Design an enzyme around this catalytic site. Structure first.
Site, PDB file in Angstrom:
ATOM      1  CG  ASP A 218      -1.939  -0.879   0.845  1.00  0.00           C
ATOM      2  OD1 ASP A 218      -2.713  -1.225  -0.037  1.00  0.00           O
ATOM      3  OD2 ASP A 218      -3.071  -1.805   1.948  1.00  0.00           O
ATOM      4  CB  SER A 219       3.433   2.431  -0.613  1.00  0.00           C
ATOM      5  OG  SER A 219       3.980   2.398   0.721  1.00  0.00           O
TER       6      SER A 219
END
Ligand SMILES: [Mg+2]
Ligand SMILES: [Zn+2]
Ligand SMILES: [Zn+2]
Ligand SMILES: [Zn+2]
Ligand SMILES: [Zn+2]
Lengths: 528, 257, 44, 49, 427, 93, 39, 117, 64
Positions: free
Chosen positions: E58-59
């Site tokens: 989740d980046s």
């Protein structure tokens, strides 16, 4: 009153005697960094120029310390106090001329936190003793804490606006104890279940599986470029597996240089056909399974979560049991760096070409669902004409609805099997499911074939209206589509009535997690 | 153990783009000059603003930002300007700067557009690109704006206002003769503009003892430098980096004794 | 110093410890006038 | 705001068309505050004479 | 942008985007709630690929030389109130410029930015730890107060207002302006529940490009899709690519039933790309082709409110309280982090006895007392003349010392005030 | 297994089933300064001051409330310097 | 400071008699006036 | 201010030196150059040239951290050759290649002063 | 609030094409044809004009 002054939580006995507020403690966000050893942490320069460490002056470090005290609070690697023998704490910020200050044996300079120091690092809720390990400082430009990825499993962390605290040991005895008791390479295997807690993780696992396939050949320049990243390389280039027509190295031949010492292990890959040990080719394995690490070199087999992750008898577990705690660190770091610097040559992605089914499959799935609906109609009509016979200990509704549920489950299983049946070797879903990095074999079928059947409170969708589920059906409809069976895929999209039932299932699944945290925290506090 | 003999061949030439082809060279050199068109070509741009009276709708740091991204004619006098950190003068002098001036006041009732035709300079060699007009702010009856700005010299690693180029296309091997990229279904992919395949083929046949050659470029320009002096100033800038590093090196292995 | 009315924008010097009202408008919201020492920005 | 009883928190089918089914906050206030749908209209009152 | 007349309102904590844009894929029920006249977001070109590992878990990787052209840039306002008050007949406050020799309670801060009134004229560049409002109280001479900024603002004074509040006391309001460029802590989110921070920023010469020079602005991880099944995210970037090439604006009314993945695929082929949004990308570092084909297209992202400039803080020997001598917050916004109960147990299981002592005693309120030997009661010690006298036992010879926390000391003193003598015998 | 065994052994050690609860911990041969950390400080301590209760300080929570080395690991012992080995020890200072 | 810094080994409770209460108090005779300060 | 200024990425400080030599002690005839204030633009242009020398056994480079500005180059040659020799012979071959390509380019743009067609 | 001067991705100058864009939509052009008459051929430079909302024309309604 006086007895009122020392009440329970937030009194004077339960709020300021054992739980209090300390100094030398910082807090900020965390972000990944694959270029750090598993025992290091990255600290910004504004935090490091604020926290200090008192260093006694001895004739071994007099010159370095007076040099540090020449530059104070302006240059970064400086100092901000001098504590002489009398207890006099003078401040370097106000002293008019610094050069007059002459350090003397016994004095005590208050240094700035530099590289190589030791700190203690924990995350928001501390559950087990792995949620507070001793790291080592390494100072970097911007303003977030930076730490490796294989250590995110113990802390249970993820980089979407998380935060972690660090505390800095002030004395020297506490520094030695933290160093020989709780450093992160010393807590790889846990006494809770006697197996490793840190294994290879999300992105390196998918690439390690592809790097050790039977057909991965590297040229000369690429092999040199990869060897440049090995920290424990002796300096010799091994002889290629294919000398003519031109020299080519293999994936396993390069991986055999990462494996430390001379260890031995035998595992299996997650797609090992169980009927392979029966016939011939037991030691040949057409599919290249049955990992074999003999005398510290990969002879055969593909690596995955069953052989590199956090399970008992893995490769990391054996390397910890035999070689020690200071070589497994290098093992982790080398694996990560080498595999990342090959992955930027090989690349990885996911799209919608990986989410597209085939013509035949679409057709077949429709047929199985049409037959499933036919069976549910037969059972219902048969029950109305009173031709059903209850089983021992089962009401007619039970017997009725549990038979309907069994038929629905069989139809769903057939649809899932059909969805699994059709994938390619180049598919990117199968590439994350097989290597065990992320996902499961049911998400594939839910994306491609059928979402399935929703249910609240462990049972079919109830009659929220009177004898109906929604004002778009007729009364007492017991069919599959009228009580929660979503027969589309996430790709083909859902119809409104299915979008509502899906929302219901999701809502209950969302409430349970909100309850669980408080419950478990309180019970553990009591027991401890 | 020696260099190559690359050969250039220009295809198009306009006042805003160049198309050429570089044959017989290595991939690392054909890429290292693709990053120099972007980063390390010097150019003039505004870098110091001081506002005397701003009664418009946008705050002071909004206008100071829409000014720096205005491109100034940097054609010939970039080689005569020192870097303001190297020049032996004070903060500013006409040897390492160019001074601008804006002063607008709205008196009629109809709204007023403050274009880039108002940036008035002192040196007639560096003017904004007007020989339409970039809009800076709109004013209402009773509002005004006046400021002073200096324009320094730099390149594109400082700030993205100093790079002289729009998109820089680049590609090689228009058909997978080398299989550097692997198509799962090679039939759904459109054929490249530079391809030489038939209308009913997908890829050229694989040849193992191959090597990338004949790189294709297309360099556009924002308006400061001509599209053919962006290239000449890049090759002359990359050469002067290696030539300076060789000095420091021979100065090291000479002081080894 | 010098203040600016909130309605008619007519500057009027208000002396220390004095009621806060405009003139020619009778209003009670005043904005202080912008300074005259200069600050420099960067286009960066 | 902390009672563990689920029946005042779960989604009722009668909420069809009058309260949004998807929009609700997480945490300890799940299903306790709710937003009403687009065309939902609340009555104001009258006399029955 | 939250309201059109945001120039007049002196709200506290107002955020405003520079260049808002309306979606390219809209629902038909957005014309009635004015989402195309006050929008919040920007259509960015997103690619779903694994590039260098900085967008895992989740980046997002984002283009650095698109941030330099205005991408997702914004501003940030904040207001402060001050009110002069007559709390007593003599204790009276007033706005004025405090002078060093007359007033007394001032710090070591500069007071040159203040004008004669005691307020800062708009236009100056006020940094952290500057005084903005000079307010002096008369002493029964003149004891000055003032208001200082928080730490790490680096704002610019926007405008200053002076008027009379309800009970008729003169009061002023001050607004501070500050520009926020996206950096590598900021939080970005899509329209389908995919939040994520920013991992690293590459220049345009390093992002992967297509065969005509279209680099993506954002790169997200493919692993975010298969576990949470948000396929609505994969169709609006396919539908969006048709809307930019045809010139219309798409339609995404929920159960319209008018759009299929197959239908959109046919249209894209005509323009001249792989049918399934897929495209052939080149590597940016070495110019080689990428063996897989990457799914790329335009999507609509939003910039959430949680920025990283607001969540970083540190403490190292800061100000402490007065009664219990426990660490207290200071002017620099930065106090200490609590060492709770669950953290006290991970250290016990670790077996670290020194680190557990340092964190609770030496880092928080250390203290020393003197204790008698025969009795276990505290003693009187005047170390200036070196007299150690124990009262009640007439002991002067064998006195002792016990190093203990301070919060435990006044616990013992409040036990002696209830006829209990806790005796700390050393043997 | 050791964890299950230890838990289910310390849970049934005093003969009868004492739950790990409020009034299950309230009853054992424990000191006065531990039952004051649980919600009935003043009354039980008044009982103690009336009956004259001692406190040996052998516990761990007892010993960190006063800021001393708890007798856990690293505190289970104490060190002594011997004057013999120092003899053949070198000396720079 | 010259007195040795030692340890604690046992805490004994008990009620204290008015005898030592009067003997070790600091304000001899006792506090008599309900007003704290006068000038 | 917790963010570095932009000029730190290419501008050398006072005490720093651009290039530094160290000999690798694990294998003979190996060396390790450490260029300062540099990046992939210059790092990659060198490595590709060294591999074209038939007397070089190893050649590679790495940027140890993308947030600092420094590269490292390792070279190993046959026992009758010197790493410092192979390094400087590589540079003089790049310069002889760029200056040649500039001449052939400036000719091509003035090959259509008015136009060939 | 006001048209940016440079596309965020390419760098091509856009800030001088907003009045001409409104002038072409004024007569009869479709958004797909007006963008081609201006020379915007990459879909990163067409997003700039196609999805721009002009808020500066509503802040000029408040008397200074
Ligand atoms: Mg999280
Ligand atoms: Zn000058
Ligand atoms: Zn007025
Ligand atoms: Zn005594
Ligand atoms: Zn563009």
């Amino acid at each position: 009153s006086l007895k009122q002054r020392l009440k329970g939580k937030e009194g004077r006995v339960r709020g300021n005697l054992m739980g209090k507020r300390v100094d030398f403690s910082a807090r900020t966000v965390i972000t990944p960094d694959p270029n750090l050893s598993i025992d290091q942490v990255g600290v910004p320069r504004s935090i490091a120029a604020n926290m200090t460490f008192a260093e006694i002056v001895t004739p071994f470090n007099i010159d370095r310390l007076q040099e540090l005290v020449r530059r104070g609070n302006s240059q970064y690697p400086g100092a901000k106090y001098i504590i002489r023998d009398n207890g006099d704490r003078i401040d370097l910020r106000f002293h008019p001329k610094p050069s007059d200050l002459h350090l003397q044996t016994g004095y005590k300079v208050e240094r700035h936190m530099c590289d190589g120091d030791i700190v203690i690092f924990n995350r928001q809720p501390t559950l087990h003793k792995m949620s507070m390990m001793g790291h080592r400082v390494r100072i970097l430009p911007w303003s977030t804490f930076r730490l490796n990825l294989s250590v995110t499993t113990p802390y249970n962390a993820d980089f979407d606006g998380d935060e972690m605290n660090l505390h800095l040991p002030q004395s020297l005895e506490t520094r030695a104890e933290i160093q020989e008791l709780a450093m992160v390479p010393r807590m790889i295997v846990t006494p809770q279940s006697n197996r490793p807690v840190m294994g290879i993780v999300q992105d390196t696992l998918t690439a390690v599986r592809k790097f050790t396939k039977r057909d991965v050949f590297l040229e000369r320049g690429e092999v040199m470029n990869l060897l440049m990243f090995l920290s424990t390389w002796d300096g010799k280039v091994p002889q290629p597996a294919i000398l003519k027509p031109r020299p080519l190295w293999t994936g396993k031949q390069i991986f055999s240089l990462i494996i430390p010492g001379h260890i031995n292990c035998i595992r299996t890959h997650s797609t090992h056909p169980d009927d392979e040990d029966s016939g011939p080719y037991k030691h040949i394995s057409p599919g290249d399974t049955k990992v074999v690490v003999e005398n510290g070199e990969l002879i055969m087999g593909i690596l995955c979560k069953k052989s590199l992750g956090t399970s008992a008898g893995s490769l990391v577990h054996i390397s910890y049991l035999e070689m020690g705690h200071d070589i497994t660190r290098l093992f982790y770091s080398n694996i990560q760096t080498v595999i990342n610097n090959w992955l930027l040559i090989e690349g990885h992605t996911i799209g919608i070409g990986d989410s597209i089914a085939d013509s035949k499959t679409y057709q077949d799935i429709q047929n199985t669902i049409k037959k499933a609906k036919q069976d549910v109609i037969e059972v219902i009509e048969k029950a109305h004409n009173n031709e059903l016979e209850p089983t021992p200990g089962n009401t007619l509704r039970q017997t009725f609805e549990n038979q309907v549920n069994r038929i629905l489950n069989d139809a769903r299983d057939k649809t899932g099997s059909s969805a699994q049946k059709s994938l390619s070797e180049y598919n990117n879903f199968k590439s994350m499911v097989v290597s065990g990095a992320k996902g499961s074999k049911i998400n594939i079928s839910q994306v491609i074939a059928v979402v399935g059947q929703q249910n609240v409170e462990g049972k079919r969708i109830p009659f929220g209206f009177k004898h109906r589920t929604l004002p778009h059906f007729i009364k007492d409809d017991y069919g599959p589509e009228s009580r929660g069976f979503v027969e589309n895929s996430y790709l083909a999209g859902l119809t409104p009535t299915e979008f509502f039932f899906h929302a219901m299932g999701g809502r209950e699944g969302l409430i349970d997690t909100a309850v669980k945290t408080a419950e478990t925290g309180y019970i553990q506090r009591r027991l401890i | 153990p020696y260099a190559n003999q690359p050969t250039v061949r220009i295809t198009e030439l306009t006042d805003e783009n160049v198309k050429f082809i570089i044959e017989n060279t290595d991939l690392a050199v054909a890429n290292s000059i693709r990053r120099v068109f972007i980063a390390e070509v010097p150019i003039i741009a505004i870098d110091w603003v001081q506002i005397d009276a701003n009664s418009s709708v946008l705050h002071d740091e909004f206008i100071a930002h829409r000014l720096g991204l205005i491109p100034l004619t940097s054609d010939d006098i970039v080689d005569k300007l020192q870097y303001s950190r190297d020049c032996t003068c004070e903060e500013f002098c006409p040897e390492c700067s160019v001074e601008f001036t804006l002063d607008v006041r709205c008196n009629e009732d109809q709204t007023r557009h403050v274009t880039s035709r108002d940036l008035i300079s002192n040196s007639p060699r560096v003017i904004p690109v007007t020989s339409d007009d970039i809009l800076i702010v709109k004013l209402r009856k009773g509002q005004e704006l006046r400021l002073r700005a200096y324009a320094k010299k730099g390149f594109g690693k400082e700030h993205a206002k100093w790079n002289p180029t729009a998109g820089v296309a680049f590609e090689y091997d228009p058909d997978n003769a080398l299989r550097h990229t692997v198509y799962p279904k090679p039939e759904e992919w459109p054929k490249s503009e530079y391809s030489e395949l038939d209308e009913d083929e997908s890829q050229a046949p694989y040849d193992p003892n191959g090597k990338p050659e004949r790189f294709y470029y297309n360099v556009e320009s924002c308006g400061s430098l001509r599209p053919e002096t962006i290239v000449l100033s890049a090759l002359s800038g990359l050469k002067k980096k290696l030539s300076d590093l060789q000095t420091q090196l021979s100065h090291e292995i000479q002081s080894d004794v | 110093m010098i203040y600016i009315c909130g309605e008619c924008h007519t500057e009027n010097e208000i002396k220390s410890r004095d009621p806060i009202r405009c003139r020619e408008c009778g209003y009670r919201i005043m904005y202080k006038k912008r300074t005259k020492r200069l600050v420099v920005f960067d286009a960066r | 705001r902390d009672g563990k009883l689920a029946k005042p928190r779960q989604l009722h089918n009668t909420l069809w068309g009058m309260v949004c089914p998807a929009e609700t906050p997480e945490g300890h206030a799940v299903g306790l505050v709710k937003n009403l749908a687009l065309m939902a209209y609340i009555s104001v009152g009258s006399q029955p004479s | 942008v939250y309201i059109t007349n945001f120039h007049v309102r002196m709200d506290t904590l107002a955020h405003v985007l520079y260049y808002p844009q309306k979606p390219l894929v809209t629902t038909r029920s957005m014309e009635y709630l004015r989402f195309r006249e006050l929008p919040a977001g920007i259509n960015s070109i997103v690619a779903i690929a694994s590039y260098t590992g900085y967008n895992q878990e989740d980046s997002v990787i984002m283009n650095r030389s698109a941030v330099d052209r205005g991408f997702f840039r914004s501003v940030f306002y904040r207001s402060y109130k001050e009110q002069e008050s007559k709390k007593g007949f003599d204790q009276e406050e007033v706005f004025e410029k405090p002078t060093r020799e007359t007033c007394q309670g001032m710090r070591h801060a500069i007071y040159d930015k203040l004008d004669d009134d005691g307020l800062i004229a708009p236009g100056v560049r006020v940094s952290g730890d500057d005084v903005i409002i000079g307010k002096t109280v008369t002493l029964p001479t003149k004891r000055d107060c003032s208001t200082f900024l928080r730490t790490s603002e680096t704002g610019i004074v926007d405008q200053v207002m002076v008027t009379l509040n309800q009970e008729g006391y003169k009061f002023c309001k001050i607004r501070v302006r500050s520009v926020r460029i996206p950096q590598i802590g900021d939080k970005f989110a899509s329209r389908h529940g995919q939040k994520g921070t920013c991992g690293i920023q590459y220049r345009q010469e390093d992002m992967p490009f297509t065969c005509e020079g279209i680099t993506p602005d954002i790169i997200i991880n493919p692993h975010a899709i298969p576990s949470r099944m948000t396929i609505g995210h994969l169709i609006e970037c396919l539908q969006g690519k048709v809307s930019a090439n045809k010139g219309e604006i798409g339609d995404a009314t929920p159960f319209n039933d008018a759009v299929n993945v197959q239908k959109i695929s046919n249209l894209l082929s005509d323009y001249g790309y792989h049918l399934r949004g897929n495209e052939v990308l080149y590597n940016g570092f070495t110019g080689r082709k990428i063996t897989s084909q990457i799914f790329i297209g335009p999507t609509y992202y939003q910039r959430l409110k949680h920025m990283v400039d607001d969540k970083i803080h540190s403490r190292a020997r800061g100000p402490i309280q007065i009664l219990n001598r426990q660490p207290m917050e200071g002017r620099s916004r930065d106090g200490g982090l609590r060492f709770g109960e669950m953290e006290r147990d991970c250290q016990i299981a670790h077996g670290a006895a020194q680190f557990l002592r340092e964190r609770l005693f030496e880092a928080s309120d250390p203290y020393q007392v003197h204790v008698c030997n025969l009795c276990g009661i505290m003693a009187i010690a005047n170390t200036r003349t070196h007299t150690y006298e124990c009262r009640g036992c007439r002991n002067k010879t064998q006195i002792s010392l016990v190093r203990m926390p301070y919060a435990c000391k006044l616990l013992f003193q409040e036990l002696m005030s209830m006829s209990i003598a806790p005796r700390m015998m050393s043997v | 297994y050791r964890h299950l065994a230890l838990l289910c052994d310390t849970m049934t050690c005093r003969g009868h089933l004492m739950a790990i609860t409020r009034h299950g911990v309230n009853r054992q041969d424990t000191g006065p300064l531990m039952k004051c950390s649980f919600e009935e400080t003043v009354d039980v301590l008044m009982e103690a001051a009336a009956h004259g209760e001692s406190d040996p300080m052998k516990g761990v929570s007892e010993n960190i409330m006063l800021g001393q080395l708890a007798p856990a690991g690293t505190g289970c012992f104490d060190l002594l310097l011997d004057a013999e080995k120092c003899k053949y020890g070198m000396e720079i200072p | 400071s010259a007195c040795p810094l030692r340890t604690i080994k046992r805490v004994q409770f008990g009620v204290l008699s008015p005898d030592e209460l009067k003997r070790m108090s600091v304000t001899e005779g006792g506090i008599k006036y309900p007003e704290t300060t006068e000038g | 201010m917790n963010a570095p200024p932009a000029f730190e990425s290419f501008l050398l400080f006072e005490g720093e030196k651009k290039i530094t030599i160290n000999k690798d002690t694990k294998v003979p005839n190996a060396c390790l150059f450490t260029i300062n204030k540099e990046d992939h633009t210059l790092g990659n242009i060198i490595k590709s040239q060294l591999l074209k020398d038939p007397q070089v056994l190893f050649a590679g480079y790495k940027v140890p951290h993308p947030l600092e500005h420094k590269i490292i180059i390792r070279v190993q040659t046959t026992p009758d050759y010197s790493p410092q020799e192979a390094f400087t012979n590589a540079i003089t071959d790049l310069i002889s290649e760029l200056s040649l390509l500039e001449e052939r380019f400036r000719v091509a743009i003035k090959d259509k002063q008015e136009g060939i067609e | 609030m006001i048209i940016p001067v440079r596309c965020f991705t390419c760098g091509k100058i856009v800030g001088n094409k907003w009045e001409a864009y409104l002038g072409l939509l004024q007569a009869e052009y479709t958004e797909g044809d007006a963008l081609d008459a201006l020379g915007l051929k990459r879909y990163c430079c067409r997003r700039m004009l196609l999805a721009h909302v002009d808020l500066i024309e509503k802040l000029l309604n408040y008397a200074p």
